[PDB]
Amino acid sequence: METITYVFIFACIIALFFFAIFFREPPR
Amino acid sequence: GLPWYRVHTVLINDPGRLIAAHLMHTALVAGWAGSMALYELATFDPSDPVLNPMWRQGMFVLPFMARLGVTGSWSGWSITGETGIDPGFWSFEGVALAHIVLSGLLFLAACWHWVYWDLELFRDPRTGEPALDLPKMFGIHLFLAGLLCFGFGAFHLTGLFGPGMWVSDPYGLTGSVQPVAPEWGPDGFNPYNPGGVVAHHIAAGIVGIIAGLFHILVRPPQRLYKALRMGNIETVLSSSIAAVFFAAFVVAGTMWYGSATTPIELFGPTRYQWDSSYFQQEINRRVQASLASGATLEEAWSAIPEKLAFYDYIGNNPAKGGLFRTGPMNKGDGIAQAWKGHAVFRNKEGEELFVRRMPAFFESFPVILTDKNGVVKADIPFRRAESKYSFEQQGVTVSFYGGELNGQTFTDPPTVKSYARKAIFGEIFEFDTETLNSDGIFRTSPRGWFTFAHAVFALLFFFGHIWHGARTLFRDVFSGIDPELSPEQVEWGFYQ
Amino acid sequence: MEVNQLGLIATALFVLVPSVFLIILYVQTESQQK
Amino acid sequence: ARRTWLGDILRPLNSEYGKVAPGWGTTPLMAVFMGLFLVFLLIILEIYNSTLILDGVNVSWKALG
Amino acid sequence: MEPNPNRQPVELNRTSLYLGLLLILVLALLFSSYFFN
Amino acid sequence: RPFSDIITSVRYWVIHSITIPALFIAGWLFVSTGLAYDVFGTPRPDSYYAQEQRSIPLVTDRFEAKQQVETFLEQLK
Amino acid sequence: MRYTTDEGGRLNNFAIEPKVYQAQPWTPQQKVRAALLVGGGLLLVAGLVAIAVGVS
Amino acid sequence: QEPVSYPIFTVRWVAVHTLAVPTIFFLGAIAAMQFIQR
Amino acid sequence: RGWFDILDDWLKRDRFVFVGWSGILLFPCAYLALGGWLTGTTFVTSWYTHGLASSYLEGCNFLTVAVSTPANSMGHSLLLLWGPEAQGDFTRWCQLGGLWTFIALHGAFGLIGFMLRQFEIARLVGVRPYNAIAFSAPIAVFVSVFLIYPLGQSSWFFAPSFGVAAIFRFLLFFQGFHNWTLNPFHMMGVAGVLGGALLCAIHGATVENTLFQDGEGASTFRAFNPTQAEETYSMVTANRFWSQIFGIAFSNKRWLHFFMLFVPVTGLWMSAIGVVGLALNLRSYDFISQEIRAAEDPEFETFYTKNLLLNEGIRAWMAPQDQPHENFVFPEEVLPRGNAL
Amino acid sequence: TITPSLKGFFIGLLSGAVVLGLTFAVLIAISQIDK
Ligand code: CLA
Ligand code: CLA
Ligand code: CLA
Ligand code: CLA
Ligand code: CLA
Ligand code: CLA
Ligand code: CLA
Ligand SMILES: C=Cc1c(C)c2cc3nc(c4c5[nH]c(cc6nc(cc1[nH]2)C(C)=C6CC)c(C)c5C(=O)[C@@H]4C(=O)OC)[C@@H](CCC(=O)OC/C=C(\C)CCC[C@@H](C)CCC[C@H](C)CCCC(C)C)[C@@H]3C
Ligand SMILES: CC1=C(/C=C/C(C)=C/C=C/C(C)=C/C=C/C=C(C)/C=C/C=C(C)/C=C/C2=C(C)CCCC2(C)C)C(C)(C)CCC1
Ligand SMILES: CC1=C(/C=C/C(C)=C/C=C/C(C)=C/C=C/C=C(C)/C=C/C=C(C)/C=C/C2=C(C)CCCC2(C)C)C(C)(C)CCC1
Ligand SMILES: CC1=C(/C=C/C(C)=C/C=C/C(C)=C/C=C/C=C(C)/C=C/C=C(C)/C=C/C2=C(C)CCCC2(C)C)C(C)(C)CCC1
């Protein structure tokens, strides 16, 4: 119940890492 | 352009839409009041008030309804215990329905003021751009505030045409709704005197009338108008936040320390009554006064109400129970059923021992049985390898007087240990834990919840106050332009 | 151990409501450019 | 604009809008009311705190007695 | 009605989404331990 | 004006090399004559406890507080 | 109206404040129109201290 | 800033004398405390 | 010109130090607080309000002295000199801990004067008063722990006494009774303060190593001291380094220097909320699941249960003489011990 | 009638009056000499 919630929130942090590195806003 | 923290800055330069928004906020507040009312009228239990009152059940708005004179129900009950009452329209369900329709009307007027936003009243026609007359506004509204304060004091509180207010005795046994006379002597600043409250609302009301007329009939002087930068709606807000957090701080303290306008039959004991061992001294006073007139212990302890003993139960402090313990106090230890009776421990020598009660500071506290002067004469050993005092070397017996157990005596060490273990809480009660599936871990009363909420909102409104106080005095640097200057229309050069 | 049925609802709302709020503002200001 | 009946009635109530009486005015009179209020707050704070005891007043629950 | 002249748009760029979402999801991980108890 | 220049100016020296020792000695005598103990109500180190008592002096009432200290001091506690 | 903040290409709004203006000494019409209100005020607060004496 | 003429009382003057005179009294107190026999 | 304006201009003259209107509240209150502490750690006892010794006169070193709080039998008293408990007698007033309230209240007024001083200087120079806003973090901390918390407990006795070891005692008392480290708001505070120091070091190093004209015989001279820097280095260099190491960097200098302001300030504010929560004795001490599992199963041990055992020990062995006005006496077979488990 | 604590409050506000009276008095005097 609780632990699935914990690992899901973890998984979306590390996904957000990936998104911030390889898809940053082009500053123009 | 606006960030997510500048979206409501498009009302600054037009009052029509500002009022639309303000009406809307008001609709939501009245709706929440009504909706919350109805919800906890579905969990309130009116059969038993003496060992199951509202503040044990975590009622939040019921104490604020009860404090001013709403007590009935159209379902035929009352919070006093009176069954078959005739309340008329004004009962809990009535005020709830009232607030919900009040919200409906407010929501409609808010809609009205949003679609129609261009009304020449808000403009000033000499330049045809929006402005307010802020001193005149404060005056008008002070006149209204004063007259309403005067009326509320003079007709409702007095019981002159209204019902009066909630009055109690010092121990919170017999309290009820009754009229109150005003008191303007130097005993009217006694903050445990109802009369001071009636005096205050009349008097404050008259000040409001006087000042309200005054601010219509005098304009501001120039030095203040330029100093405090009036004519800028963002400074009214700056002042109001300061006032509002002053008020929250002082009600936080008045709720936590107690006053006559926060009774202990609607908000439960304060923690300062447990520290001073208030009800305990009263119980002993009654017991010695009954023994002195001739009595044995059984009769003497049978003549103490259940209610007076219930307050000497530490489970009613608003200073037990933590932040992420959520539920009524009844979730905490279950619902009380009965008073076991006063427990007296004695050794086999015969001498009467006294159980040292637990401060509020701890989560767990030893059981150390002390005699008359203060020397330890028995104890429950934490060790399981070592004892010099135990309930097998000092042979302590518990005897019960009053309550369910009149004259019961246990002399078997484990049962006597269990009684000592739950008698550092004070008086011993029978609980039913299956109804809520309680866990035995403490919970705080509504009082603690209220004061905590308001003591943190006040501290946040401090930062609010400084931020807005800055944005009005440093307005000429947050924007590059000065409102002193009217926008520039025509350029002159100077070039070699 | 007793784990709350309502602890899960607090968790669920706590993330989902602000996330969809910010996302809607973002797609709104993206259609502001194109 | 929207010419409407209640707006015209309230029109003269918002028509000064920036007018001010010359110089200091009643600032020295404000300061008198202001000071009295602060002294009032100290009196009613110290009574509550039991730092100012005025005979015939008893600051406890037992005044509902 | 006649259009409001005080109508301005609202912005939120991508890096603010990343930051903001991080804060939301992180704050959830800290307080979820206490909600579940 | 730099502080270095006024500190080594003759006007400073002529008054201050007379007043500086006076202050140092006034402090020294405030302690050495036993007066420091009598002004700040700090007990002498042979006298924190009475003969009879082995318990500390402790205040237990706020309006009869000075009365309780006056009593504790007569019994030489 | 207020167009501000090229820091990110952004907006911030602030109030438009009226101009200041030194009062003109009152006309006799202004004096008598004011007189009704203050006279009403005088008797109104008298009457309310009267109700106050009655309700105790 | 403050005129070089420097009349006897000056903002600077009181500032350096409310941090000079008590300290020379107090350091003379502490020094005497060092020779008190326990 | 009228007397008010002459006075006002003279308060705003060009001096070594600015006095200003805010100075009028600032300087007496600050001086008297600071002197009050200096005369207290040097002469004033605590022998009648804690049974401890904390003075150079009594004989103690720099770390163990304090100006100590009043007793628990004084309640929430303001402790005026002319009030009805010292009744105008200096010796009693120092003995009863009245010097504690002197420092606390005068120091609150010194802090108010100081934030007002920051506003006043900002407005006469004409800069934004952001440094005053930054200074609301100390005030939040101070009014929550030295004023709001004791006004919730039972007296000023649990207010934090001014002193080195006296504050070290506060830490153990909080660790043992409230379990402060497990509260989430303090968790957020620790992260914020360490995060502020983190940005301090990184900024300080990466500006120092990317300067324009670190050789070249620097032909820039101004300075322009109020800039502080923030053109003596190339932003493009910095960005281009960090964006490869950590995979993210700033690209806007303004927002960097606002993030530096944002982080440690938000930290202290969250902790200030946390401790005003403790004033009502609303704490998180335990997780209810762990307690029921541990009651049902005693073969269950975690690092958290362990913390509970340690806290249980701190309280019982420190309390009988930390709180002597409770008169606890605990036999040595009831005090907690690990070897009894 | 008067209680001792009430005299104490009177003492208190009289020292308050004195110390603010003095501070603004000397500051008004000092400013208006060297204006
Ligand atoms: C902590 C700092 C702080 C700061 C930066 C501000 C900033 C400001 N306030 Mg605010 N204010 C504060 C605290 C503060 N306030 C507090 C705590 C209160 C009480 C709730 C107020 C209530 C207040 C109001 C209601 C208003 C202001 C206004 C103002 C602005 C006007 C000019 C000014 O400088 O006044 C600063 C002057 C003061 C704060 C006066 C200090 C008074 C003292 C020293 C009282 C001492 C009494 C007595 C001698 C000792 C008591 C002893 C005690 C133990 C009993 C402004 C900059 C106005 C505003 O919004 O401007 C836009 C306005 O409407 N102030
Ligand atoms: C900026 C100046 C300043 C400020 C803000 C403070 C602030 C404070 N001082 Mg203080 N003090 C100062 C300078 C200052 N000090 C100086 C220079 C001295 C040395 C002489 C002292 C010496 C001193 C002592 C020794 C003590 C304090 C105390 C106090 C505090 C307690 C509150 C109190 O008693 O209020 C007093 C204020 C009032 C009663 C308000 C006075 C209001 C006036 C002036 C109006 C009167 C108008 C009119 C005549 C009234 C008519 C009334 C009638 C209608 C009934 C407060 C923290 C005490 C303390 O901290 O206790 C914990 C304490 O022991 N002060
Ligand atoms: C139209 C009149 C009206 C009436 C008669 C009521 C009547 C009631 N409301 Mg209510 N309410 C109204 C409109 C009204 N409502 C509106 C418009 C709102 C939305 C903003 C609300 C929102 C509201 C809430 C949220 C709640 C109630 C509640 C209640 C009930 C309990 C008593 C109570 O809480 O009093 C207590 C009232 C006070 C303590 C008021 C204190 C006022 C302050 C501090 C004013 C100080 C500022 C002043 C200007 C200072 C200067 C004064 C000057 C003269 C000198 C009572 C039956 C409660 C309830 O049980 O609802 C079911 C509740 O929680 N009301
Ligand atoms: C703001 C003031 C306030 C206060 C003091 C209370 C107090 C009360 N409410 Mg309550 N309530 C409020 C507003 C408030 N309410 C509002 C606005 C809502 C509508 C959404 C509710 C909804 C509500 C429900 C649903 C119930 C109550 C109940 C109760 C009572 C039972 C005790 C309890 O379970 O506490 C619970 C305490 C709270 C709800 C507030 C404290 C919350 C926690 C633990 C954390 C707060 C911080 C949070 C994690 C966010 C952190 C963010 C971070 C970034 C800083 C208690 C007396 C219960 C009841 O009727 O019992 C019979 C019940 O079931 N109330
Ligand atoms: C009391 C009334 C009040 C009013 C009328 C305003 C009005 C305003 N403030 Mg202010 N403010 C207040 C209180 C108030 N504030 C308080 C208490 C604080 C201290 C935290 C601040 C701190 C503050 C800052 C620091 C800033 C503003 C800004 C703004 C403006 C921006 C628009 C906006 O709505 O934000 C848009 C909406 C959001 C930011 C979303 C908030 C989501 C939250 C956190 C709450 C969700 C609802 C909440 C749980 C409901 C319960 C409320 C509770 C108090 C009972 C606006 C004109 C900004 C400004 O000046 O712009 C130029 C700016 O920089 N305010
Ligand atoms: C003969 C007429 C008369 C009488 C008998 C009263 C009687 C009363 N008035 Mg009063 N009053 C009157 C006329 C009268 N008034 C008039 C004409 C005015 C002006 C219009 C006022 C203005 C007034 C005010 C301003 C207040 C009262 C309050 C009160 C009552 C509360 C007593 C109490 O509980 O203290 C309770 C509390 C205190 C004495 C503490 C005051 C605290 C101060 C001033 C500072 C706050 C500092 C800071 C922001 C807090 C930080 C807290 C943090 C550390 C935890 C009492 C019923 C008070 C009230 O409603 O309290 C609930 C309140 O604040 N009245
Ligand atoms: C290891 C990491 C760590 C870190 C980073 C922190 C971080 C923090 N802790 Mg700590 N803490 C920790 C571990 C840690 N904690 C542990 C393990 C415990 C054991 C239980 C505690 C127990 C603890 C307690 C009990 C408290 C904190 C508090 C604080 C915070 C307040 C900021 C501060 O220091 O205020 C320090 C003080 C101030 C900012 C006030 C400054 C006052 C002024 C400006 C005085 C004037 C100075 C000077 C004389 C003027 C000079 C003039 C001259 C230059 C001209 C901060 C969030 C406090 C807190 O959160 O309160 C809100 C608090 O009450 N902590
Ligand atoms: C314990 C840690 C700590 C200390 C010691 C401290 C100290 C100080 N912070 C100041 C400022 C600030 N601090 C800031 C953020 C922070 N400050 C923090 C933590 C601290 N800050 C943290 C963590 C932050 C990050 C958010 C900012 C942003 C500012 C400033 O802008 C400001 C400044 O000017 O910095 C240079 C200075 C105010 C100078 C002044 O004119 O005082 C005015 C007050 C005076 C003169 C006296 C006040 C009253 C007294 C005497 C009572 C206290 C008790 C006595 C000192 C007795 C001794 C106590 C013992 C425990 C030793 C001062 C040096
Ligand atoms: C239209 C109409 C109508 C109807 C209406 C209605 C139906 C209403 C209702 C209303 C309502 C019914 C409303 C409600 C609202 C609510 C709210 C508004 C709430 C809020 C909340 C909050 C704000 C919270 C917060 C919090 C949380 C969440 C957690 C923690 C704590 C706190 C407090 C922070 C009628 C028919 C009558 C009439 C005609 C018309
Ligand atoms: C005080 C008092 C009282 C009460 C009163 C009241 C409360 C009143 C009311 C008032 C109000 C509160 C009112 C309101 C109203 C509103 C309205 C009237 C609205 C309207 C609107 C409309 C009509 C709209 C329309 C629209 C639009 C605009 C858009 C779209 C949609 C629609 C179409 C819908 C009583 C009796 C108890 C007595 C004593 C005193
Ligand atoms: C309490 C009181 C009061 C006040 C008084 C005062 C205000 C005092 C002052 C006092 C003071 C104000 C003192 C001072 C002291 C100081 C000292 C004692 C110093 C020392 C120093 C040194 C020795 C140095 C050291 C060092 C450092 C710091 C750093 C580095 C290292 C070295 C080693 C160099 C009055 C009368 C109001 C009222 C009644 C009570």
Euclidean distance between termini CA atoms of chain D: 64 Å
Total discrete domains of chain D: 1
Structural class of chain E: mainly alpha
Number of extended strands of chain D: 1
Report the radius of gyration of chain D as a whole number of Å: 24 Å
Number of discrete helical segments of chain E: 1
- Beta-strand content estimate of chain D: under 5%
Q: Work out the helix count of chain D.
A: 2
Helix content of chain E: 55-70%
Helical amount among residues of chain D, as a percent range? 40-55%
Largest interface, with Cβ-Cβ < 8 Å?
A: B-I, 52 and 50 residues
Shape descriptor of chain E = elongated
Oligomer: part of a larger assembly
- What are the secondary-structure elements of chain D, in order, as H or E? HEH
How far is the first residue's CA from the last residue's CA of chain E? 53 Å
H/E series of chain E: H
Cytoplasmic side (chain G): 1-33
InterPro entries (chain G): Psb34-like
Subcellular location (chain G): Cellular thylakoid membrane
Function (chain G): Involved in photosystem II (PSII) assembly and/or repair, probably in conversion of late PSII assembly intermediates into mature dimeric PSII.
Please specify the SSE layout and strand pairing:
The structure is cut from a larger assembly and holds ten protein chains of ten kinds.
Chain C: H1 5-30
Chain F: H1 3-7, H2 10-32, H3 35-39, H4 65-74
Chain I: H1 3-11, H2 20-40, E1 66-67, H3 90-95, H4 98-125, H5 130-134, H6 136-148, E2 162-163, H7 164-177, H8 184-208, H9 235-245, H10 253-278, H11 288-296, H12 303-322
Antiparallel strand pairs in I: 1-2
Protein name (chain A): Photosystem II reaction center protein T
Subcellular location (chain A): Cellular thylakoid membrane
Lumenal side (chain A): 1-2
